[PDB]
């Protein structure tokens, strides 16, 4: 039952990276440049060490990075100061541990460029915006919120995704609507029963590799670097994989209400704010959040498969017929937003 205070500490990360049989530098894709980070701005040109690259526009920004669209087929550039070789390590590892079939669920990194004061990562592109953006689009519409059938559908894919990541003994560490993105697969999704298509997960900067740590290690940090806090962090309790369970539930809560989840303690259990009576499938959602939020300990993680089945049951009873229309409607909204 080993203990590590902070898994996101820079000193710790440098120690793990430095203490590797296969340094990141060893990878073929990675490149180390002595010079400072090049000036990168939309509608400009610069050479990525060797070949010239054209940046068309800024797709999105986070607390750590700015992501631009680039060409010469289109891809993206993830720029951040200081350098973040860690993301490349995690991304590289993840594709290696994953089954080849499941790689399309996550962003692939083609190459990494490490500068003196920053890093630039070249990665796959997803052109139809984040899950958060999609949630915001509905607010303008009459429904004001995502249809349940799409919520449930997106939810089951998420549970399926973290299951694959956790099998790799990896923790995402930052599961939010901002870090979910919509790509072509969502557009071309033809098989509803296939959970591998229509949703992709990104932002591996805050990810944790459990392989590097002893068996049964635990973390006691009371918040994630951006300040993201799960239930264990609030309760001063230890945690490892629970943070991703909490993240999925927070992301699903957002699809349901279009507002970030807030937590409260009622009786002996932890519950989210405002699960009102008129909410469809209220029983199912109460059960879903109860399990995802109230985990007794690190050794009793809820079955991701079981949760998925409970949602699948409700989906098969009420939304198999209506799903195509709901997806088409969303597709039109995504196209409209992308036109802007
Ligand atoms: N592959 C991608 N395609 C399109 N946009 C992306 C891609 N990756 C990231 N983004 C955009 O970048 C923003 C944040 O990127 P992320 O990787 O989460 O960086 P950070 O760690 O700083 O949050 C997102 O809101 C998203 O719009
Ligand atoms: Mg992010």
Q: Counting ligands in written order, which one lies closest to the CA of residue 70?
A: 1
What distance in Å separates the CA atoms of residue 207 and residue 109, rounded to the nearest whole number? 15
Is the separation of the CB atoms in 25 and 32 below 8 Å?
A: yes
Q: How far is CA 24 from the centre of its chain?
A: 23
HEC string for the chain: CCEECCCCCHHHHHHHHHCCCCCHHHCCCEEECCCCCCCCCCCEEEECCCCEEEEEEEEEECCCCEEEEEECCEEEEEEECCCCHHHHHHHHHHHHHCCHHHHHHECCEEEEEECCCCEEEEECCCCCCEHHHHHHHHHHCCCCCCCHHHHHHHHHHHHHHHHHHHHCCEECCCCCHHHEECCHHHHCCCCCCCCCCCCEECCCCCCEECCCCCCCCEECCCCCCCCCCCHHHHCCCCECCHHHHHHHHHHHHHHHHCCCCCEEEECCEEEECCCCCCCCCHHHHHHHHHHHHCCCCCCCCCCHHHHHHHHHHHHHHHCCCCHHHHHHHHHHHHHHHHHC
* Structural resolution in Å: 2.4
Residue 72 burial class via C-beta count within 10 angstroms: exposed 0-12, middle 13-18, buried 19 and up:
exposed
> Which amino acid residue places its CA nearest to atom 4 of ligand 1?
126
Binding site membership of 178 for ligand 1 (Cβ less than 6 Å): yes
Task: Name the residue with the closest Cα to ligand 1, atom 27.
Answer: 60
126 lines ligand 1 (CB under 6 A): yes
CB-ligand 1 contact for 202 (6 Å cutoff): yes
* The two three-digit tokens of residue 335, written as one number: 């196209």
Distances (CA, A) of 167 to 200, 202, 211: 17, 17, 11
Q: How far is the CA of 86 from the centre of ligand 2 (A)?
A: 15
> From the annotation, which residues make up the binding site for ATP?
59-67, 78
Q: Domain spans of the chain?
A: 1-49, 50-340
Binding site: residue ranges? 59-67, 78
Protein residues near ligand 2, an ion, with CB under 5 A: 62, 178-179, 203
**Residue 198 in contact with ligand 1 by CB distance below 6 A:** no
CATH number of 50-340: 1.10.510.10
Omega before 82 within 30 of 0, i.e. cis: yes
Substitution candidate for ligand 1 out of 60, 107, 172 with most atoms within 8 A of CB: 60
> 122 C-alpha to center of ligand 2: Å?
16
Q: Whose CA is nearest to atom 18 of ligand 1?
A: 203
Show the tokens assigned to 92. Answer: 């590289």
Determine if residue 281 is left, alpha or beta; phi over 0 gives left, psi from -120 to 50 gives alpha, anything else beta. left
DSSP one-letter code for 268: T
* Known catalytic membership, residue 209: no
Going by alpha carbons, the residue nearest to atom 26 of ligand 1 is 60
Rounded Cα–Cα distance for residues 113 and 270 (Å): 44
Ligand 1 touching residue 63 (CB < 6 A)? yes
Bridge partners of 111, per DSSP, are 122
Q: Is the CB of 288 under 6 A from ligand 1?
A: no
Shortest-distance atom of ligand 1 to CA 67: 12
DSSP secondary structure letters along 36-56: PPPP--TTEEEESSSSEEEEE
Work out the angle between the directed axes of helices 148-167 and 304-318 (0-180°, nearest 10).
Answer: 160
**Nearest residue to 323 via CA among 192, 198, 194:** 192
- CA angle (151 as vertex; 148, 153 as ends), nearest 5: 110
Pocket lining: 70 vs ligand 1, CB cutoff 6 Å: no
Q: Do domains 1-49 and 50-340 have the same CATH topology?
A: no
CA of 107 to the centre of ligand 2 (A): 13
Round to whole Å and give the CA distance between 258 and 112: 35
Testing ligand 1's pocket by substitution, the residue of 57, 58, 59 carrying the most ligand atoms inside 8 A of its CB is 59
Name the structure determination technique: X-ray
Q: Which member of 9, 167, 174, 244 is catalytic?
A: 174
| 1-49 belongs to CATH 2.60.120.620 | no
Q: Decide if 220 contacts 107 (C-beta within 8 A).
A: no
Can you tell me the distance from the alpha carbon of 13 to that of 25, in angstroms, rounded to the nearest whole number?
15
- Rounded-to-integer distance, Cα 231 and Cα 270, Å: 8
User: Which residue has the CA at smallest separation from atom 5 of ligand 1?
Assistant: 59
């Amino acid at each position: 039952n080993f203990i590590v205070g902070n898994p996101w500490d820079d000193k710790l990360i440098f120690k793990l990276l430095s203490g590797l049989s296969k340094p990141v530098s060893s990878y073929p894709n990675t490149f180390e440049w002595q010079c400072k980070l090049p000036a990168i701005k939309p509608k400009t040109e610069f050479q990525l060490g060797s070949k010239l690259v054209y940046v068309h526009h800024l797709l999105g920004e986070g607390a750590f990075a700015q992501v631009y669209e680039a060409t010469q087929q289109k891809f993206v550039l993830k720029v951040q100061k200081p350098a973040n070789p860690w993301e490349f390590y995690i991304g590289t590892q993840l594709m290696e541990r994953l089954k080849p079939s499941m790689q399309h669920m996550f962003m692939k990194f083609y190459s990494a460029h490490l500068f003196q004061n920053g890093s630039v990562l070249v990665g796959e592109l997803y052109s139809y915006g984040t899950l958060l953006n999609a949630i915001n689009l509905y607010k303008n519409t009459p429904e004001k919120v995502m249809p349940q059938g799409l919520v449930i559908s997106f939810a089951m894919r998420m549970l399926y995704m973290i299951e694959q990541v956790h099998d790799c003994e990896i923790i995402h560490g930052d599961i939010k609507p901002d870090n979910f993105i919509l790509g072509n697969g969502f557009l071309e999704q033809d098989d509803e029963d296939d959970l591998s298509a229509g949703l992709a997960l990104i932002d591996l900067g805050q990810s944790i590799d459990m392989k590097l740590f002893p068996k049964g290690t635990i973390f006691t940090a009371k918040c994630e670097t951006s300040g993201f806090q799960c239930v264990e962090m609030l309760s001063n309790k230890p945690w490892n994989y629970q943070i991703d369970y909490f993240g999925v539930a927070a992301t699903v809560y957002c699809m349901l209400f279009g507002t970030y989840m807030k937590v409260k303690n009622e009786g002996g259990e932890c519950k989210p704010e405002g699960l009102f009576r008129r909410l469809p499938h209220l029983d199912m959602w109460n059960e879903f959040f109860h399990v995802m939020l109230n985990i007794p300990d690190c050794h009793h993680l809820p079955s991701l498969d079981l949760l998925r089945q409970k949602l699948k049951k409700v989906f098969q009873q009420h939304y198999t017929n209506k799903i195509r229309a709901l997806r088409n409607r969303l597709i039109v909204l995504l196209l409209e937003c992308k036109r802007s």
